[PDB]
């Protein structure tokens, strides 16, 4: 599956594959771009079947009904939501066009790399555990991009030697889409990847 957006902003494209023979993904993603914001947010259930679609899927709809707050906020609400249930990893990110800024929070292993055209790179380490209902030690990243940024948020379905180097070469989102095709082939796992290019 992939879904291209655009506005004045930000170009995105999310891919999403299925490992292969799985008829039910574990990983979900949410994302809404306005002219001002940019909220998203990758998600990967623990355990197999329904039930770790049933904790990702509550993810997406909880960053999806609750947007409007801190990344802070929403990923509390998230930690909530999986007590009596599977759990997670997941990332959320919220971009402010105007200021230039954006905001990420994560726990768990789903990862995000920030690429900027001076070279600067912003990619956290991932924090240990999962989103469970139980306590977290939260961190949470507040940073200014320059024009031209391109980021990836991946789920650890995506297996790449050296995701920098894609996000540096590629020109655009497709670009980057496609010279990452070799590695979403070898998968094992579900894999779901956003890519944006920020303006
Ligand atoms: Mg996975």
Sequence with gaps: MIQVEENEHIQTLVYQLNKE???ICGDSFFMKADDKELICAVADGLGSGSLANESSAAIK??????????????IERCNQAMKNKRGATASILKINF????????????????????????????????????????????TATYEKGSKFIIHTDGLNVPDIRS?????????????SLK????????????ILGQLS
């Design 98 to 141: 105007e200021q230039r800024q954006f905001t990420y929070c994560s726990v768990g292993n789903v990862r995000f790399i920030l690429h900027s055209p001076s070279g600067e790179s912003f990619y956290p380490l991932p924090i240990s555990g999962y989103l469970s209902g139980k306590p977290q030690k939260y961190k949470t990243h």
């Design 61 to 74: 709809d909880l960053v999806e009904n609750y947007a409007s707050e801190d990344v802070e906020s929403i």
């Design 182 to 193: 070799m590695y979403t082939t070898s998968r094992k796992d579900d894999l779901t990847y």
């Design 21 to 23: 023979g799985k008829s």
């Design 166 to 178: 894609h996000l540096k070469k590629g020109q655009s989102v497709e670009e980057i889409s496609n």
